[PDB]
C-alpha cells in the first residue's frame, strides 16, 4: 500500500534479520572473552530481542568491543523499527482524521 505501511513491514523483516544476525555475531564476538555470558545462540537470540526493545533486564550483555558494537546496531535497528511503526501509526491516524473533516 503506502510508504509508511511498507516501511513498517520492511523494518519488521529487517528487525528479524538483524535479530538473527545479531545473536550470531554476538556469540562469535563474545566467545574468547573470559567471564562472558552472551555465548550460546538460543539465549543470545533472547538477549537480542531484549536489546531491540530496550527492555533491559541485565541478565545478559556484551563485554567485548565487537559485542558492544553488535549491540549498538541492534538497539538502533530496534529503536528505529519500533519508532517506524509509531510513525506509521501516526500517519494512519492523521489521514483518517483528515477524512473525518471532509478535508
Amino acid at each position, epitope marked *: 500500500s503506502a510508504l509508511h505501511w511498507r516501511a513498517a513491514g520492511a523494518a519488521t523483516v529487517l528487525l528479524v534479520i538483524v535479530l538473527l544476525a545479531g545473536s*550470531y555475531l554476538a*556469540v*562469535l564476538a*563474545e*566467545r*574468547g*572473552a*573470559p*567471564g*562472558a*555470558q552472551l*555465548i*550460546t*545462540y*538460543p539465549r543470545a537470540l533472547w538477549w537480542s530481542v531484549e536489546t531491540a526493545t530496550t527492555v533491559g533486564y541485565g541478565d545478559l550483555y556484551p563485554v567485548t568491543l565487537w559485542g558492544r558494537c553488535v549491540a549498538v546496531v541492534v538497539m538502533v535497528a530496534g529503536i528505529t523499527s519500533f519508532g517506524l511503526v509509531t510513525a506509521a501509526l501516526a500517519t494512519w491516524f492523521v489521514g483518517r482524521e483528515q477524512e473525518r473533516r471532509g478535508h
Partner: antibody, heavy 118, light 106 residues
Framework: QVQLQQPGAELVKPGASVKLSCKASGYTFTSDWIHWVKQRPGHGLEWIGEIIPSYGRANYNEKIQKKATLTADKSSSTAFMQLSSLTSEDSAVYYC???????????WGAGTTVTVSS | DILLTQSPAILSVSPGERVSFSCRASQSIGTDIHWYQQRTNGSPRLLIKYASESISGIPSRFSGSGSGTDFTLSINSVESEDIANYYCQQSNRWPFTFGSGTKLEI
C-alpha cells in the same frame, strides 16, 4: 553413526610437531563449533580450544601454555589441531567434540592418543 | 574462570542402591551444567544436559538436579554398566570448564 573420526594414534619426537584431524559427518550447520579436549593418563578432561568452521574463528584456553592452532576445511568438513614443539607433558588422548552452539558436547571422537618420545 | 568441584573423587555403593554425585560451581551458573560418563578406554558420553534435561538413548535411572552453584547427578539402583568416571561441565561463562570428575564403584 560415528559423527567425528580421528586417527587412533600419532607418535611424535620431542620438539617436533603434529597435526591431528577430526572429520565430521551427520547434520552440519554454520553455528557448529568443534572443541578439542586433552586427557593425560590418569587425568581428567581439559579444554584446549574451540573453532567455528564457518567464520573460521578459534579461541584457546588461556589458562595453559598455548601449544595449539586450530583450523578447518569447509569442504571436507575436517577440523585440524596443530600441536607444535611437544614434550612428555604433551602426551595424552586428544578428543574432539561437536557443540551445537548451545553449550554441551553432543558427540565426541574416539580420540587420538599422541605419545611423545624419540 | 569458573571452577567446578566434584567431591568425593571416588564413590562406593551396593548394587541396586541410589547414588548421587555432587558438582559445586565457584559461582552461580544457573542450570548451565552438563554431565558426561566415561568408561575405561572410552570417550565421554552425554548423560544430562542443562542440569535436568535427559538425553535420548540414556537409561531412565539417570537423573540430574540443581541450580545456581550446586548440582547432583543421581542413579536409581546402580548397575555394573554404570561403573565409570563422571564429569560435569558448565557453559555459563567462557571458557567452558570441567569438574575433576568422580569415579563410581560398586
Amino acid at each position: 553413526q560415528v559423527q567425528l573420526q580421528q586417527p587412533g594414534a600419532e607418535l611424535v619426537k620431542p620438539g617436533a610437531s603434529v597435526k591431528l584431524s577430526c572429520k565430521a559427518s551427520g547434520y552440519t550447520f554454520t553455528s557448529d563449533w568443534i572443541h578439542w579436549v586433552k586427557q593425560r593418563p590418569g587425568h581428567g578432561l581439559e579444554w584446549i580450544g574451540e573453532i567455528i568452521p564457518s567464520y573460521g574463528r578459534a579461541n584457546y584456553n588461556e589458562k595453559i601454555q598455548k601449544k595449539a592452532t586450530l583450523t578447518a576445511d569447509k569442504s571436507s568438513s575436517t577440523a585440524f589441531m596443530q600441536l607444535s614443539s611437544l614434550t612428555s607433558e604433551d602426551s595424552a588422548v586428544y578428543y574432539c567434540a561437536r557443540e551445537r552452539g548451545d553449550g554441551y558436547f553432543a558427540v565426541w571422537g574416539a580420540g587420538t592418543t599422541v605419545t611423545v618420545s624419540s | 574462570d569458573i571452577l567446578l568441584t566434584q567431591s568425593p573423587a571416588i564413590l562406593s555403593v551396593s548394587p541396586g542402591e541410589r547414588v548421587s554425585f555432587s558438582c559445586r560451581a565457584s559461582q552461580s551458573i544457573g542450570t548451565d551444567i552438563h554431565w558426561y560418563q566415561q568408561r575405561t578406554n572410552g570417550s565421554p558420553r552425554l548423560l544430562i544436559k542443562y542440569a535436568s534435561e535427559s538425553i535420548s538413548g540414556i537409561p531412565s535411572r539417570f537423573s540430574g538436579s540443581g541450580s545456581g552453584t550446586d548440582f547432583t547427578l543421581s542413579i536409581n539402583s546402580v548397575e555394573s554398566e554404570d561403573i565409570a568416571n563422571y564429569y560435569c561441565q558448565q557453559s555459563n561463562r567462557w571458557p567452558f570448564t570441567f569438574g575433576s570428575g568422580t569415579k563410581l564403584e560398586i
